[PDB]
Amino acid sequence: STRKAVIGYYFIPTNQINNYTETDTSVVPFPVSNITPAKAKQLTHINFSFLDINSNLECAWDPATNDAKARDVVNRLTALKAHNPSLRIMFSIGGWYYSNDLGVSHANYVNAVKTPAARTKFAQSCVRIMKDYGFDGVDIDWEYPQAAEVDGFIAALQEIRTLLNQQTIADGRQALPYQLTIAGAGGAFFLSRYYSKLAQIVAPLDYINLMTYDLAGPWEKITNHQAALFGDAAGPTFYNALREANLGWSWEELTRAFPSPFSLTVDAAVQQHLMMEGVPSAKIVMGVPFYGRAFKGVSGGNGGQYSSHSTPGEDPYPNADYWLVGCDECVRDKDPRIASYRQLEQMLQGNYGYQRLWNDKTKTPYLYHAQNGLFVTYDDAESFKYKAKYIKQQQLGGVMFWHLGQDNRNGDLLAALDRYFNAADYDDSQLDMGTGLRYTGVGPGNLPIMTAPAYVPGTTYAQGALVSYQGYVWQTKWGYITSAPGSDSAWLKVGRL
Ligand SMILES: CNC(=O)NC(=N)NCCC[C@H](NC(=O)C[N-][N+]#N)C(=O)N(Cc1ccccc1)Cc1ccccc1
Numbered sequence: 133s134t135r136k137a138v139i140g141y142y143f144i145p146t147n148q149i150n151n152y153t154e155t156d157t158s159v160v161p162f163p164v165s166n167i168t169p170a171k172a173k174q175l176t177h178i179n180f181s182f183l184d185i186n187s188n189l190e191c192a193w194d195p196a197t198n199d200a201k202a203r204d205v206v207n208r209l210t211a212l213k214a215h216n217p218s219l220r221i222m223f224s225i226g227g228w229y230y231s232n233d234l235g236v237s238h239a240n241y242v243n244a245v246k247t248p249a250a251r252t253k254f255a256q257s258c259v260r261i262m263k264d265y266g267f268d269g270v271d272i273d274w275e276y277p278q279a280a281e282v283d284g285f286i287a288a289l290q291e292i293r294t295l296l297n298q299q300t301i302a303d304g305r306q307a308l309p310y311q312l313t314i315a316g317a318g319g320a321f322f323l324s325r326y327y328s329k330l331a332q333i334v335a336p337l338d339y340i341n342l343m344t345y346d347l348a349g350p351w352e353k354i355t356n357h358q359a360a361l362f363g364d365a366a367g368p369t370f371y372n373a374l375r376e377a378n379l380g381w382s383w384e385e386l387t388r389a390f391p392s393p394f395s396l397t398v399d400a401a402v403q404q405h406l407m408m409e410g411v412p413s414a415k416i417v418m419g420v421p422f423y424g425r426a427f428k429g430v431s432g433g434n435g436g437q438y439s440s441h442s443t444p445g446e447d448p449y450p451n452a453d454y455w456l457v458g459c460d461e462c463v464r465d466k467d468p469r470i471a472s473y474r475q476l477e478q479m480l481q482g483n484y485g486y487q488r489l490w491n492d493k494t495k496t497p498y499l500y501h502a503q504n505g506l507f508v509t510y511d512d513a514e515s516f517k518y519k520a521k522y523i524k525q526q527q528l529g530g531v532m533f534w535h536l537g538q539d540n541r542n543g544d545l546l547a548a549l550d551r552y553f554n555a556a557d558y559d560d561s562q563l564d565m566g567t568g569l570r571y572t573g574v575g576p577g578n579l580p581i582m583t584a585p586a587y588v589p590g591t592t593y594a595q596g597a598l599v600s601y602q603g604y605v606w607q608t609k610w611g612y613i614t615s616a617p618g619s620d621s622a623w624l625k626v627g628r629l
Pocket of ligand 1: 315
């Protein structure tokens with residue numbers, strides 16, 4: 133069996149690069165030296181983030197970046213490869229701040245992919261940056277192209293792919309070829325922007341790293357788990373926006389693929405990808421958060437889950453009330469709404485009044501502060517057992533996480549992921565996946581194996597009848613049908629032999 137990818141973001145802001153030091157955590161909280169040899173061996177990829185696209189429509193460092201310091205920080209990451217010959221140091225272009233619809237560089241993303249000439253110039257700059265700084269591949273985190281941008285974006289990925297392949301040959305890197313990945317939407321609403329062209333988007337990639345987290349946040353009316361593996365029938369449900377994608381499918385095909393409303397979960401996003409023909413499970417990487425999302429003003433009853441709340445949604449955080457009791461990092465970062473797993477462990481250990489609770493449907497933990505009305509949705513080594521098992525069972529390519537600086541000091545989240553995939557003595561064959569709600573959609577890419585009596589010409593088939601014919605199992609949509617399955621619109625392809 134081939135090794136699961138373990139992809140960790142390394143995020144460092146420009147001011148920290150410009151003042152880079154390994155001996156002052158109040159200037160750089162998580163320097164490269166915290167990535168020990170043992171961590172380096174547990175990772176397959178580190179995604180250095182974030183570069184940007186400039187107004188010249190080229191991949192570029194933030195213009196305030198000190199170049200010598202940048203090279204130095206990158207050199208420190210690539211030196212980690214000494215401990216792990218499989219390890220790649222990628223760089224990521226984009227992120228939410230640079231690339232969101234209202235982000236500071238958004239128009240550069242749109243314009244870079246818009247014409248053949250712009251794509252060539254952009255693609256070349258990506259490979260030039262990669263070679264200049266010693267990176268091992270390119271990750272694109274544009275959140276998110278839409279509409280006519282999608283065709284440009286696909287052409288841009290195809291062109292970057294060809295240039296990476298040229299570079300792999302030029303460098304004799306066939307043992308560790310240069311790679312191309314993107315960070316993909318992990319929820320139907322954003323995914324619907326490019327969903328109909330998913331196979332084309334994924335074809336040029338080594339992996340699509342699904343952002344299957346941030347599925348709950350202060351923008352929602354109701355608290356919820358941000359990365360539930362499976363659904364909880366007591367939780368909120370959402371309109372399935374994919375059924376409105378430009379797919380050209382029939383009513384029955386849409387309905388069978390896109391139940392609505394549906395539970396917004398990791399399993400939903402993964403299945404939504406697998407339903408598409410030409411999207412291989414081995415390219416799908418499951419993102420997990422190394423941080424929790426915190427809400428205030430929540431009611432009692434169900435541990436703070438699925439409650440109204442009074443958490444500000446504005447950015448930046450609009451006042452100086454840091455109400456996440458015990459979160460020192462929140463004070464430092466002026467935002468009580470996000471806490472690293474590292475910080476959450478300390479909050480749980482201190483005398484701050486949190487209970488750690490567990491939802492056995494979603495297979496995720498949450499903190500509840502009964503006295504102040506606080507709710508925190510996060511992941512730990514325990515929720516990772518179910519996710520890693522799901523990853524193995526669904527034959528996904530691996531796991532990605534945001535971000536390395538958020539693991540605890542011992543790096544237990546990373547070590548847990550590595551152990552669940554690679555430890556000879558770890559056994560999850562008996563781990564019970566629970567009865568949480570599964571996403572049941574079936575599309576052309578994930579037909580189940582089925583059997584049925586062979587189709588017989590001259591027979592009149594009632595609605596709902598199942599037959600096998602030319603490699604597939606088919607179901608009549610109404611009765612009485614006598615046509616050969618697949619030859620007109622009366623038959624639904626429901627399974628494969
Ligand atoms: C590798 N790429 C990603 O992981 N991308 C990603 N998570 N994109 C969506 C995130 C949107 C943004 N996310 C975070 O703050 C993640 N936190 N961490 N760690 C987000 O939640 N908001 C948009 C934003 C954030 C910062 C600056 C500008 C815009 C809204 C928000 C609401 C409440 C607290 C923090 C952010």
